[model samples]
Target: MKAAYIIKEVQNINSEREGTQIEATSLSQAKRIASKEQCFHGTVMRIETVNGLWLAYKEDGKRWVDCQLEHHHHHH
Candidate 1:
C-alpha cells in the first residue's frame, strides 16, 4: 500500500509559501521525500500522514461539472 504526506515549510515572519504534497510507498519513503531538497529548502515545518486515496471523487454534492477536456485539444 501507499500513502500521501504534506510537508509544510517551517514558516518565518516573511515566508510566503505554504506546503507541498508528496506520495510514498511507505513511511520510510515519505520521510525520504521530506528530506529531499526539492520538497523544502529550509527547515521543515511539519510532516504528517494524509489518510485517503490519492485519486478519488469528491462528495461536494454537485454533479455534471465541466472538466475542460475540449480546451486541451486546441493548438497554437
Candidate 2:
C-alpha cells in the first residue's frame, strides 16, 4: 500500500518538468526513488504527494527527511 507522487526537476523554468510519477511509502521515499533512479533532470525543485502535500527542495540540498524541517513541526 503506497501512494504516487511527482518529482519536478527544474533546470531554471516553471512547471511540467518531468512529473516522474512514482509510487512510494511516503514523501521521503519518493525523493529517494527520484535520487536513486535519476528519474528527472535538473535540480529537484519540488515533489507532489498523493494527498497534495508539496515538499519543495531547499537551498541546503539536504536529505528529504531533514528537508522536512521547513514543513514538519519537529516531532521532538
Candidate 3:
C-alpha cells in the first residue's frame, strides 16, 4: 500500500460528523459503544453493508483490524 484512503466508521443519520472520522483501529476499542447503538448511542451500520466495506468492527463483531485489512475491504 503506497498511499491509503481513509474511511470513517459508518454512523447514523443526524449524527454524522463528517469532520470527526475515527480511524477504524480506534473504534475497535470503542466497538463496545458502537455495538450497542440501539440506545443512547443510537447509530450503527448494517453489518451486511458494513462488512463489504468495513472489517473495523468485525473481529468480536467490531474489529480493530489493521488499516491494511481495511484498505482491502473496500477494494471489493
Flag the better candidate by TM-score, 1 or 2.
2
Task: Give stretches of model 1 more than 4 Å off.
Answer: 12-17, 38-42, 51-76
**Candidate 3 or 1, higher TM-score:** 1
Q: Compose the digit string of candidate 1's lDDT tens values, residues 1-76.
A: 7666665455442333555777779755654565553333433334543532122111122221212222245566
Q: Which stretches of candidate 3 lie over 4 Å from their true place?
A: 1-25, 39-52, 57-76
RMSD of each: 12.6, 5.7, 9.1
Model 3 RMSD in Å is 9.1
Better of 1 and 3 by lDDT: 1
Question: RMSD (Cα, Å) of candidate 2?
Answer: 5.7
Number of clashes in every candidate structure? 1, 0, 5
Worst lDDT run of 10 residues, candidate 1, spans 52-61
Find the candidate with the highest TM-score and give its number: 2
Winner by TM-score between candidate 3 and candidate 2: 2
Q: Considering lDDT, where higher is better, how would the candidates rank from best to worst?
A: 2, 1, 3
Clashing pairs in 1: 10-45
lDDT of 3 at 61: 35
Candidate 2: residue 2 Cα off by (Å)? 0.4
